[PDB]
Ligand SMILES: CCCCCCCCCCCCCCCCCC(=O)OC[C@H](COP(=O)(O)O[C@@H]1[C@H](O)[C@H](O)[C@@H](O)[C@H](O)[C@H]1O)OC(=O)CCCCCCCCCCCCCCCCC
Ligand SMILES: CCCCCCCC/C=C/CCCCCCCC(=O)O[C@@H](COC(=O)CCCCCCCCCCCCCCC)COP(=O)([O-])OCC[N+](C)(C)C
Ligand SMILES: CCCCCCCC/C=C/CCCCCCCC(=O)O[C@@H](COC(=O)CCCCCCCCCCCCCCC)COP(=O)([O-])OCC[N+](C)(C)C
Ligand SMILES: CCCCCCCC/C=C/CCCCCCCC(=O)O[C@@H](COC(=O)CCCCCCCCCCCCCCC)COP(=O)([O-])OCC[N+](C)(C)C
Ligand SMILES: CCCCCCCC/C=C/CCCCCCCC(=O)O[C@@H](COC(=O)CCCCCCCCCCCCCCC)COP(=O)([O-])OCC[N+](C)(C)C
Ligand SMILES: CCCCCCCC/C=C/CCCCCCCC(=O)O[C@@H](COC(=O)CCCCCCCCCCCCCCC)COP(=O)([O-])OCC[N+](C)(C)C
Ligand SMILES: CCCCCCCC/C=C\CCCCCCCC(=O)O[C@@H](COC(=O)CCCCCCCCCCCCCCC)COP(=O)([O-])OCC[N+](C)(C)C
């Protein structure tokens with residue numbers, strides 16, 4: 001009754017140590033780890049240069065915060081992965 | 095060009111007038127079409143609303159001025175993305191997502207078709223990829239965006255009115271699209287049911303002779319059946335308990351009141367598209383659902399579906415089901431005597447000598463008939479449904495075990511005429527399956543049915559997890575024991591068989607002296623009967639208790655679905671026998687159709703009592719002056735007038 005959630009979270013840590021050891025066992029085999037991510041332009045660095053980062057995408061849905069004039073959206077004009085986007089001349093300026 | 099999207103992007107309406115002057119001197123028409131952003135199809139208009147600032151660019155008014163003076167205004171507003179991934183997303187769709195009431199007004203003045211189909215892959219069904227499906231049409235975008243002002247606008251603006259009845263690529267109308275977008279969360283459910291009401295009410299003000307909910311998409315699905323086939327319980331609950339108090343939108347109600355004498359009030363639920371209807375019944379779509387199909391088990395707790403099935407149960411299916419249990423018991427009593435009293439001398443088939451040997455053949459012939467019967471009922475279940483390989487093994491646990499029983503029967507026939515003693519091997523399995531399959535017929539009984547659902551769940555989560563680890567340990571230490579044994583229990587079967595005697599409490603810790611190391615032999619069995627008997631069996635009990643605590647309500651709602659599939663199959667088995675299903679309802683006048691004619695509907699009565707809403711000047715009561723079934727009523731000259 002008590003260890004139901006604790007056992008699920010020891011499991012995910014067990015699986016995690018397997019994920020890491022698998023990565024660390026194959027620095028030579030395949031190449032490294034397949035990088036688990038993508039190098040995306042989130043914006044611009046404060047010195048004006050590009051801010052490219054290895055970033056993980058998580059689609060999310062929200063039925064309460066409808067309007068939310070974000071602006072902080074980094075590539076709105078293309079609205080997905082698709083092909084390369086516009087970068088949205090909003091907040092970024094460089 | 096390059097600088098135009100730069101200037102349409104940057105809110106700077108000074109350089110544009112210089113290019114109003116430029117495009118004047120060629121044509122503006124193809125040149126804007128040549129100034130569509132390649133690889134996307136963005137003319138300058140779509141670019142503008144993308145890069146807005148506080149709800150206005152201030153180039154959007156100007157870019158309309160370039161297009162109204164100089165010819166061909168339509169090809170700027172009717173324009174859209176050209177790519178296959180945003181195919182058909184006109185600039186009108188943009189204003190609806192960015193929640194700009196104004197720009198929806200501005201564009202529709204200048205054309206901007208309100209029926210532009212946003213075909214693009216971003217705008218298609220779930221796809222397992224990023225995207226938002228709303229129904230491809232701007233009216234459906236507004237409904238799925240919490241823009242009720244933009245809904246009412248696009249239907250009565252002044253110039254071009256949206257079509258409530260129009261369909262998308264997949265045939266889904268707006269209301270279908272309100273079902274596809276639901277996600278079984280409260281705030282979505284609060285909304286979609288609110289917005290489902292308004293368009294559904296609006297479609298009685300405009301186009302008062304349509305009945306939107308009867309509209310079927312490409313897959314022949316209505317918004318109700320699509321809510322039931324896709325697991326949408328909140329929308330289903332809304333559509334089914336729908337009561338609209340407005341006069342000219344009362345016929346669109348679905349939960350009526352027939353009388354209210356004090357706290358008592360008798361409600362009527364329509365049964366259109368729930369009972370054995372034409373295309374897709376809500377009971378069939380719920381009962382015969384694929385296994386993913388979320389909330390299969392909760393969609394029937396939505397009133398009146400419990401009472402409606404419990405009505406069918408108590409009226410014709412209960413008396414038929416108990417006859418099915420009887421004829422199966424007799425069948426099991428007859429295949430059991432025909433097997434108990436089998437020949438034990440010579441090879442099959444076996445000639446007849448005495449009268450006692452005649453009775454069994456009547457029991458053996460008659461026993462094969464049921465195997466043929468339960469064999470075809472499994473072929474019918476296959477072709478009447480076409481279940482996928484997944485659904486075949488994950489929710490059809492009954493039909494598997496009656497069909498499987500049938501296969502051992504026919505194999506018992508193939509071998510009884512092929513001169514082989516292995517008919518007995520199949521014949522005893524068909525018995526053991528058969529008697530275990532009386533646990534099927536515990537589903538006519540609430541306490542025994544729920545009991546047998548728990549048996550199902552225990553087998554699948556608790557015992558299958560158990561028997562993996564137990565067989566790993568068993569075979570594990572078994573090999574370690576027989577390896578140690580030297581010349582008898584020097585076998586892997588007899589050691590695996592002796593190590594299974596421990597769990598059943600029949601384990602000798604000295605079933606061999608034919609070894610050379612005794613510490614090794616007993617440390618290895620103590621290791622076994624601690625990690626299997628003490629630990630893993632008593633752990634199993636602990637897991638079951640955890641399970642029973644959780645599946646209490648889930649097992650009651652798998653039971654009601656089990657019973658429901660029996661109700662439906664009983665109906666569908668007797669299209670010819672009695673007549674159909676006894677109709678489970680009554681044809682009552684709920685009111686008048688908006689064209690003045692009678693609104694007769696097959697409706698289910700539910701008496702209800704209320705000790706809080708005492709006064710409730712309903713008016714929506716449909717036959718108050720007679721206050722019950724009784725004899726025919728007055729119809730109550732209130733709200734109805736025809
Ligand atoms: C490599 C091997 C290849 C094998 C290929 C072929 C495999 C064929 C068998 C597969 C199954 C083998 C047994 C293990 C699985 C579990 C069995 C069990 O509990 O399923 C309960 C079943 C429920 O019904 P339903 O389906 O209507 O319920 C569904 C269901 O709840 C669904 O989730 C709901 O969504 C849906 O609404 C609802 O409707 O209830 C009965 O089936 C009646 C009771 C039956 C008795 C239950 C006890 C155990 C029976 C099996 C043991 C038989 C003993 C004799 C064996 C002799 C030979 C060794
Ligand atoms: C030829 C002779 C053949 C053998 C004799 C049998 C012949 C065939 C017999 C056919 C008739 C079936 C029994 C009907 C009993 C009355 C119904 C009733 O009111 O039940 C009550 C409970 O009662 C139980 O729960 C009883 C036990 C249920 C398990 C099955 C017993 C079957 C009896 C025989 C076993 C034979 C085994 C096989 C033997 C080979 C009501 O049910 P409930 O719990 O309230 O749930 C109902 C659902 N609801 C409440 C949500 C609405
Ligand atoms: C040799 C070892 C044998 C057992 C190995 C088993 C595999 C190893 C590990 C299993 C547990 C981990 C896997 C989980 C799978 C989840 C997906 C799923 O649908 O699972 C289903 C079956 O999942 C099974 O694993 C059942 C497979 C065997 C069926 C029973 C055969 C009899 C076994 C008897 C023991 C003797 C064995 C034979 C004699 C030795 C159960 O999930 P569900 O029903 O969907 O639950 C929710 C239902 N709902 C969505 C409608 C609410
Ligand atoms: C699902 C079943 C439940 C009921 C059974 C419960 C036990 C598990 C069932 C297991 C099924 C396999 C049984 C043994 C193999 C077949 C016979 C054979 O040829 O054996 C050979 C292999 O000799 C060994 O010592 C065995 C080596 C490993 C074989 C099994 C692999 C793992 C199977 C899964 C293991 C479980 C863990 C993983 C899965 C959870 C020799 O041994 P023998 O048999 O004597 O062969 C004749 C030799 N003789 C000529 C000298 C006489
Ligand atoms: C939904 C849930 C309910 C339904 C459940 C449905 C059924 C569930 C159960 C399923 C289990 C069915 C197993 C097969 C049939 C019995 C074995 C057999 O035929 O033995 C024969 C041959 O056997 C061998 O030769 C096997 C050799 C490997 C031993 C491993 C299996 C031990 C069997 C027991 C494991 C118990 C494990 C208990 C826990 C799993 C007899 O052997 P023998 O000729 O006298 O001696 C040869 C010895 N030697 C060849 C090895 C040297
Ligand atoms: C979980 C992780 C892995 C764990 C690994 C664990 C294993 C580690 C251990 C490894 C060592 C195992 C023993 C090696 C062999 C010794 C000799 C032998 O077996 O028999 C000899 C003597 O037989 C006897 O019965 C006399 C006593 C023998 C020594 C007993 C040591 C007990 C250690 C307890 C340690 C507890 C460890 C608890 C571990 C939790 C030979 O004589 P026989 O002909 O066979 O005897 C029959 C005649 N008689 C009836 C007169 C006796
Ligand atoms: C409430 C429910 C549960 C309780 C009651 C359960 C049922 C009654 C309880 C127990 C049964 C008691 C024994 C029966 C007689 C022995 C066998 C026999 O004579 O014929 C054969 C098999 O028998 C059959 O296949 C069935 C028919 C038997 C013959 C008499 C008519 C019975 C009708 C029953 C109608 C169906 C059942 C009733 C429903 C319609 C024998 O075959 P043989 O190869 O010649 O073997 C020699 C046998 N002898 C030497 C002994 C002769």
Ligand SMILES: CCCCCCCC/C=C\CCCCCCCC(=O)O[C@@H](COC(=O)CCCCCCCCCCCCCCC)COP(=O)([O-])OCC[N+](C)(C)C
Nearest residue numbers: 418421422424425453456457460463464466467470493496
């Ligand atoms: C010596 C003895 C003297 C006394 C004799 C006493 C005789 C005693 C009586 C019967 C003995 C056995 C005869 C066959 C019936 C087998 C059992 C059976 O059908 O159970 C069914 C009841 O069945 C019914 O309610 C209808 C009766 C069967 C009609 C067809 C018989 C097969 C003929 C050939 C047809 C070939 C073509 C097939 C298509 C027509 C079970 O009900 P169900 O609702 O189906 O539920 C099970 C299915 N499910 C769980 C998977 C959902």
Ligand SMILES: CCCCCCCC/C=C\CCCCCCCC(=O)O[C@@H](COC(=O)CCCCCCCCCCCCCCC)COP(=O)([O-])OCC[N+](C)(C)C
Nearest residue numbers: 498500501502503504505508509514516517519520521523
């Ligand atoms: C889904 C499938 C398609 C469905 C639609 C169409 C279905 C087909 C239509 C009609 C039915 C016909 C089916 C084929 C029967 C062929 C004969 C036969 O099986 O003999 C078996 C006998 O039996 C035994 O040895 C023990 C009992 C097992 C028999 C299982 C048969 C049914 C399948 C149940 C599966 C259980 C396992 C799954 C559950 C755990 C095998 O042994 P044998 O051959 O007699 O060996 C000696 C004889 N020999 C020398 C000639 C070799």
Ligand SMILES: CCCCCCCCCCCCC
Nearest residue numbers: 432433458461462506507510
């Ligand atoms: C106990 C039921 C019958 C067991 C034998 C099966 C083979 C067929 C027997 C009768 C012939 C049927 C066509």
Ligand code: NA
Nearest residue numbers: 598599600601
């Ligand atoms: Na014991």
